[PDB]
Amino acid sequence: QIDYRDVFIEFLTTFKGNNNQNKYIERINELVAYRKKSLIIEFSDVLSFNENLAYEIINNTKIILPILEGALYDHILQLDPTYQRDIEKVHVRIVGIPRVIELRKIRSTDIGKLITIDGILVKVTPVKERIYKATYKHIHPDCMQEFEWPEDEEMPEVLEMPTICPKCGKPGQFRLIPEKTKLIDWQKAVIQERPEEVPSGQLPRQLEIILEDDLVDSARPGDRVKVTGILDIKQDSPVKRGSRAVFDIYMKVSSIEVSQKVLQELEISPEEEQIIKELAKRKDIVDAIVDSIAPAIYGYKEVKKGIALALFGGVSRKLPDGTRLRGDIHVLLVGDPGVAKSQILRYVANLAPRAIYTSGKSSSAAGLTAAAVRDEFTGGWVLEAGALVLADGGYALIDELDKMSDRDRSVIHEALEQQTISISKAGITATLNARTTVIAAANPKQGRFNRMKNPFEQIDLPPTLLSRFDLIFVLIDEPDDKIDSEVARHILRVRRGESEVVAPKIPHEILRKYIAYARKNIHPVISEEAMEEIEKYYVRMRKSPITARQLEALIRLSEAHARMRLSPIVTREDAREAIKLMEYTLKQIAM
Amino acid sequence: QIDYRDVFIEFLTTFKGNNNQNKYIERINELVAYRKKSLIIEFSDVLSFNENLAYEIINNTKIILPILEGALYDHILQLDPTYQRDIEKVHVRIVGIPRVIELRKIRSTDIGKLITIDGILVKVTPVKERIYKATYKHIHPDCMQEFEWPEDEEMPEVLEMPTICPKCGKPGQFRLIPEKTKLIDWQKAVIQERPEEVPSGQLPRQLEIILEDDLVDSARPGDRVKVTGILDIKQDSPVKRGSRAVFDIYMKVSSIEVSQKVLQELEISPEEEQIIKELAKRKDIVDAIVDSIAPAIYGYKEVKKGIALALFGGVSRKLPDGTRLRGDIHVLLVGDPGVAKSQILRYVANLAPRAIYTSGKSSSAAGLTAAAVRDEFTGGWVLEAGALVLADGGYALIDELDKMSDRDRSVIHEALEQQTISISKAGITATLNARTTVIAAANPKQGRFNRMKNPFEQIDLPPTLLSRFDLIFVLIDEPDDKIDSEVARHILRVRRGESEVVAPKIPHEILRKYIAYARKNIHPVISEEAMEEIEKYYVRMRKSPITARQLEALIRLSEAHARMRLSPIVTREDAREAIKLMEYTLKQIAM
Ligand SMILES: Nc1ncnc2c1ncn2[C@@H]1O[C@H](COP(=O)(O)OP(=O)(O)O)[C@@H](O)[C@H]1O
Ligand SMILES: Nc1ncnc2c1ncn2[C@@H]1O[C@H](COP(=O)(O)OP(=O)(O)O)[C@@H](O)[C@H]1O
Ligand SMILES: [Cl-]
Ligand SMILES: [Cl-]
Ligand SMILES: [Cl-]
Ligand SMILES: [Cl-]
Ligand SMILES: [Cl-]
Ligand SMILES: [Cl-]
Ligand SMILES: [Mg+2]
Ligand SMILES: [Mg+2]
Ligand SMILES: [Zn+2]
Ligand SMILES: [Zn+2]
């Protein structure tokens, strides 16, 4: 950490304008005299005064700005303590700040200007050296003198020689002198689009960037970075023809920092915020939701409640004392073929605000996780995001998880538990966030597993994976004349076109907004009561087989129930509900 | 959306002819004075007045045309309200719209003209920049000046710098000045023939196309597109003779849009249409059709009825509430060695208007589905279409399905259920329509399975696949003296050269025409009576096994039957007949 508060104040009080006037001393004065609450700062001014500050404003905008406003405020109360009786705070507005362009939208209108790109590094060359001023010796018996070539002019990226010795005037052989030539650190790197911004199966576009001097080695392959610089056009075969008058685009980096991915939340309407605030009050809230989850289905009151809790999720707090505590809850539905599994998933996607519906079988290399791929056209490797990476921060409804890739099975455990996926290929080592909630459907290898034989050996999924699902609903279909009829009826109605009173009790769009608010602003805290009940339940159920991992889920489900409750506090009623669901699942395994 | 209605009217009221006259104001006036019902518009005129409209007419002809006609009509009733007592509608005719050429038929007579090709994108280069107008500096101590090069002339594709400085007149070294040079976005892409238009196992031809400025990135690899532009010739190695004076052909794009595949229907002569209604009123129509399916075989009344319903298909309806509903019905014939399966398929192929008879094993990489293949001569990948993709919108009579590729088993579930096949290879990700009805034959792993052993395990196809066939006819051949005798006769007869007595009971040609009509115009609506019968049956058959999948099939078969009725309303008779067959197939399992 460094103090940008003094450079900022120093910049305001000493920067010089077109007429050697203190541009900002005067602007701060008017602001005072007219009781204004914003100071308009030009980016180029700061950039020219102190590059470090300029870039801190670009790379750490959200943290640095509030500090600068505070420093400006204190500075103002110093000029006039009275300002405070009229204004509580000041706003600094930086105009002229480099546009943020998505890598794949770079056009000719951007060449020559200062912009900023977001991406991931996939290649770095070793540090080399560039000549920005040479010294040649005119090997000639009458001459043999030396001189700095590009006179009053930096050498070109292409290397140019002196046709006519400027010391002797006569041509000849020029033998570059290294000892007296000046050098600058150079490094070529390649950055690709952020995996999340690329359509499944598609190759992520790439861009060449040049780091020089102090920027050399600011990052390593596999790093997510924010690069700011000027784009220009180049050619591998310079100043000559070749195939045309077509040029490649590359950036001359000015600043580069490793960054963190920023999920973009959904717009909250204070109108909606209260609307939701209203439903929360409602008493049959918990049940409407479950009943709104997937109407085009008869019953499954419990199964629907599972999905419901999954959508809201648990605490999800990662802290020092005990590192990461995952709040996302995963739900798996194993069942007899034709029991609506593959169906129910698809239905939730239609409710999906931030989801991805996909199956255990993929046609893309990434699949359900991620992977490094080779790009024939560029010859370099790149990272492609599978479903869990694309679904980060959201939901990933996985169907036929039974038929999942070999590559997927390997890294699958990491994504569900660690909530990340690490990739190592070529010189690339990157860790992508897979903070996503999972709801998958699975079938037993041969078909109905209803046979007294255990349910889990019948499914093509290692018991290691199973232990990772907070709730697993073993499903079987036994005909109960009435129920079959019920299902039939339901199906016949759905098949017959429109006119179907199969609408969610609660409103979908309004529910989406419901959940989001629910995951962003509400963070349930464990209750004393819950703690007691669950604890007793745990010993009880174990006295019955169970694992501490189940306990892990228990707490998560409780938190979830409470999040729909938005208390935000857990309550015995909560826990109870949580354990209730959990037991129903266990008696289910008994088939 | 944009409204082309005002631009259109604007074009009519303001366009200017060769003699500054309002060309169209006068054409509209004569149309009025002479009570004409068609306005002739020249494509070139529209194109020169407003490119967006010109291309909307080219890319969205079917939708845009009626709108323009409507707008012209109103413009007309405005000039003369009376025009309406003599004419109801006006037609706009666009003379001069670019011709639509099949990629493989491009010839020298097309170079230089505006045409339109239909294809699928397979490669896209990253966005580059092209100099259309440069700025050059004369590196020379006496000159050192600047100047835009191609004077009054755009820089050519190839880079050409002045031999003699136009400022000083004296030759020397020239240094490009990027900052003062003007750039235009550039992109090279490769388009291939529509998979459907390419013979099995054959490589689809390709074409280089150049996108510039705002056409850059109008699509991605894997996309079906409609490109409009001018073809020209190029040499990868400019101005120098390579191997000969032969040139490649590429297109300079003017317009490119992602398109949808357009199946072309059969032409119903209103005579055939009336004939059709007469046939429909007929008494033994259902049985007529079955007897006409394949007389060259005796019996198999139910099998012939199955095939029959498969051709007419179910409702097939894609809508939001329950997204995609599949109407195509799939039939599978499992049997003993020598029970006539292979023969029957091929016989139904003879009646095939929109079908592809083909075996389970293929010698082509595509096979039954599709696949990305590599082309050695061009070095790029391409998409090839298998039987289900070529048969889209039609039928695919598969024989010996038992013997199918590894790649096939993988993606076939998609084809039968989703009626699509997705492919991901290199930077290509495409989804090809596979809306095709399947009728296959299959043999048991080794032989006769009469054994008490369950039929399906003996045929090499995962139960997952079988569950996708609405009707499966397990066949077995027992002697029963007389019947064998019947077959002998048939075969012996079939050996006579001309016209063995039995043949289509109903006119084949007329039948094809029949089905097509049925499928296009008929859309049977489920019926109350049907609803209850089927429901009561669902519960009944489940009382002794059965699945909801059986339900969605039952409903489709009903619709099909009613479709041959052409009501279009299902009836109690429907379901009844539908379930009748369904039962027969089930009793058949017991072997
Ligand atoms: N309770 C139910 N509510 C609505 N539809 C049901 C229900 N039970 C079964 N179905 C039917 O089951 C069908 C889906 O079966 P499916 O989920 O594809 O089996 P699987 O999961 O093994 O692939 C749907 O078309 C639906 O009509
Ligand atoms: N009902 C039938 N009508 C006409 N021909 C039949 C009939 N049943 C059997 N055949 C004879 O069976 C032969 C075809 O046997 P085939 O279908 O090739 O056995 P598979 O299906 O195992 O390959 C034909 O040449 C045909 O003469
Ligand atoms: Cl921006
Ligand atoms: Cl800008
Ligand atoms: Cl990330
Ligand atoms: Cl045409
Ligand atoms: Cl022409
Ligand atoms: Cl298609
Ligand atoms: Mg399924
Ligand atoms: Mg055969
Ligand atoms: Zn010299
Ligand atoms: Zn000159």
Domains in chain B: boundaries: 1-97, 98-133+182-262, 134-181, 263-591
A506 CA distance to ligand 9 middle (Å): 28
Q: Which atom of ligand 1 is nearest to the CA of A491?
A: 27
Q: Give the distance from CA B274 to its chain's centroid.
A: 29
**What sign does the dihedral B351-B355-B359-B360 (CA atoms) show?**
negative
> A377 vs B123: CB contact, 8 Å cut-off?
yes
Is B39 in contact with B31 (CB distance < 8 Å)?
yes
Q: Looking at the complex, does the CB of residue A169 fall below 8 Å from at least one CB of chain B?
A: no
CA–CA gap between residue A546 and residue A550 (Å, rounded): 7
Q: Cα(A130)–Cα(A159) distance, rounded to whole angstroms? A: 10
Q: Which of residues 516-555 of B touch A (CB under 8 A)?
A: 525-526, 531, 534-535, 538-539, 542-543, 546-549, 551-552, 555
A232 and chain B in contact, CB less than 8 A: yes
Asked if A333 contacts A465 with a C-beta cutoff of 8 angstroms, the reply is no
Report chain A residues whose CB lies below 8 A from the CB of B551.
488, 491-492
What's the rounded Cα separation, in Å, for the pair B116 and B190? 15
Strands (E), B400-475: 420-425, 428-433, 437-442, 471-474
Contact between A480 and B543 (Cβ < 8 Å) = no
Q: Which of residues 121-150 of B touch A (CB under 8 A)?
A: 123, 125-131, 134, 139
Q: Which of A213, A22, A204 is nearest to A104 (CA)?
A: A204
Other residues' Cβ atoms within 10 Å of the Cβ of residue A88: 8
Give the residue ranges of DSSP H helices in A227-358: 270-281, 285-293, 301-312, 341-349
Place of tokens 């025409």: B513
CA dihedral over A451, A453, A456, A458, signed as positive or negative? negative
CA–CA separation, A371 and A367 (whole Å): 8
Residue type, A290: V
Continuous segment of H or E residues that includes residue A124: strand A114-124
Query: Would you call the peptide bond into B507 cis, given omega within 30 degrees of 0 as the criterion?
Result: no
Name which of A366, A406, A361 is nearest A204 in CA terms: A366
Q: How far apart are CA A132 and CA A398, in angstroms?
A: 56
- What would the 3-class secondary structure string for A342-410 be? HHHHHHHHCCCCCEEEEECCCCCCCCCCEEEEECCCCCCEEEEECHHHHCCCCEEEEECHHHCCHHHHH
CB-side exposure of A534: number of CA atoms within 13 Å? 27
* Partner residue facing B539 (CB), from A241, A248, A485: A485
Decide if B176 touches A, using CB distance below 8 A. Answer: yes
Shortest CA distance to A552 belongs to which of A328, A336, A394?
Answer: A328
Q: Domain A263-591 has what CATH class?
A: alpha beta
Cross-chain Cβ contact B429/A338 below 8 Å? no
Would you say A166 and A178 are in contact if contact means Cβ atoms under 8 Å apart? no
- Domain B1-97: CATH architecture, name and number where available: 2-Layer Sandwich (3.30)
A243 vs B: CB within 8 A? yes
Element (H, E) at B22: none
- Rounded to 5 degrees, φ, ψ at A482 are -55, -50
Q: In terms of Cα–Cα distance, which of B158, B335, B351 is closest to B237?
A: B158
**CA–CA separation, B426 and B374 (whole Å):** 10
Cis ω before A507 (30° cut-off from 0): no
- B556, B327 Cβ separation under 8 angstroms: yes
Four-CA torsion A513, A514, A520, A525, nearest 10 degrees: 180
Rounded CA separation B213/A135 (Å):
43
A240 sits in the region (left: phi over 0; alpha: psi -120 to 50; else beta) called beta
Bridge partners of residue A185, in order along the sequence: A129
Interhelix angle B4-14/B61-79, nearest 10 degrees:
50
CB of B257 within 8 A of CB of B54? Answer: no
Q: How many CB pairs under 8 A join A and B?
A: 152
Residue A2 CB neighbour total at 10 angstroms:
9
Interchain contact A171–B (C-beta under 8 A): no
DSSP character string of B174-192: EEE-GGGSEEEEEEEEEEE
Asked if the Cβ–Cβ distance from A202 to B179 is below 8 Å, we say no
The answer as to CATH 3.40.109.10 being correct for domain A98-133+182-262 is no
Instruction: Tell me how far apart the alpha carbons of residues A115 and A102 are, in angstroms, rounded to a whole number.
Output: 10
* Closest by Cα among B541, B534, B537 to B589: B541
Query: CA geometry: angle at B231 spanning B228 and B237, to 5°?
Result: 135
Q: Cβ separation of B319 and A494 shorter than 8 Å?
A: no
Distance of alpha carbon A273 from alpha carbon A163, whole angstroms: 75
Q: Which of A202, A240, A484 comes nearest B539 by C-beta? A: A484
Chain A interface disruption, residue of B155, B217, B321, B428, most A CBs within 10 A: B321
> What is the rounded distance in angstroms from the CA atom of residue A189 to the CA atom of residue A182?
23
The DSSP string of B282-297 is: -TTHHHHHHHHH-TTS
Give the chain B residue nearest A487 (alpha carbons): B548
B163: which DSSP letter? S
> Are A201 and B429 in contact (CB < 8 Å)?
yes
Residues forming a β-bridge with B332: B440, B472
Dig out the tokens for B232 from the structure: 């020209």
Determine the 3-state secondary structure of A35 from DSSP: coil
Q: Within the 367-396 window of chain A, which residues sit less than 8 Å (CB to CB) from chain B? A: 375-377
CB B494 within 8 A of CB B538: no
CA neighbor of B457 nearest in space, from B560, B334, B326, B346: B334
Residue pair A534/A582 in contact by the 8 Å Cβ criterion: no
Q: For atom 24 of ligand 2, which residue has the closest CA?
A: B340
Sign for the CA dihedral angle at B166, B168, B170, B176 comes to negative
Report how this structure was experimentally obtained.
Answer: X-ray
Task: Give me A440's structure tokens.
Answer: 């998958």
Tell which one of B552, B554, B555, B556 to mutate to probe ligand 1, the residue whose CB is within 8 A of the most ligand atoms. B552
| Angle CA A350–A193–B383, to nearest 5 | 70
B131: left (phi over 0), alpha (psi -120 to 50) or beta: beta
Name the residue among A552, A303, A316, A312 with its Cα closest to residue A441: A303
Atom of ligand 2 nearest to the CA of B297: 3
B341 marked among binding-site residues: yes
Q: 10 Å Cβ neighbour count for A129?
A: 12
Partner residues linked to A62 by β-bridges? none
**Separation in Å, CA A251 to CA A111, A431, A578, B129:** 9, 25, 55, 14
**Cα–Cα nearest to B136, from B148, B118, B150:** B148
Q: Ligand 11 center to residue A175 CA distance, Å? A: 12
Of B45, B482, B393, B11, whose CA–CA distance to B196 is shortest? B393
CA angle A485, A488, A489 (to 5 degrees): 85
| CB-CB contact of A297 with A490 (8 Å) | yes
Q: B539, A481: Cβ pair inside 8 Å?
A: yes
Q: Which residue has the tokens 């009336």?
A: B274
In angstroms, the CA A101 to CA A115 distance is 7
B434: contact with A, CB 8 A cutoff:
no
SS3 (DSSP) at B49:
helix
Is the Cα torsion angle B214, B219, B225, B229 positive or negative in sign?
A: positive
What top-level class would CATH report for the domain A134-181?
Answer: mainly beta
Ligand 2: does its nearest atom lie under 6 Å from the Cβ of B343?
A: yes
Q: What atom of ligand 2 comes closest to residue B441's alpha carbon?
A: 21
For strands B135-139 and B128-133, give the pairing. Answer: unpaired
Residue B399 marked in a binding site: yes
Angle formed by the axes of helices B548-565 and B528-542, nearest 10° = 140
- Ligand 1 atom closest to Cα of residue A344: 17
User: Within 13 Å and on the Cβ side, how many CA atoms surround A90?
Assistant: 25
Is there a contact between A118 and A100 (Cβ–Cβ < 8 Å)? yes
Distance CA A533, CA A541 (A): 12
- B318 part of contact set with chain A, CB < 8 Å: no
The finding on whether B297 has its CB within 6 A of some atom of ligand 2 is yes
- Which 3 state secondary structure label does DSSP give B559? helix
Measured in angstroms, how far is the CA atom of residue B174 from the centroid of ligand 12? 9
B156 CB within 8 Å of a chain A CB: yes
**C-alpha atoms less than 13 angstroms from C-alpha of B106 in its C-beta half-sphere:** 25
Dist. CA B575–CA B385, nearest whole Å: 37
Q: A106: which chain B residues are within 8 Å (Cβ-Cβ)?
A: 127
Strands B206-212 and B224-234: unpaired
- Given a contact cutoff of 8 angstroms between Cβ atoms, the answer to whether B136 and B146 are in contact is yes
Cβ atoms within 10 Å of A63's Cβ, excluding its own: 9
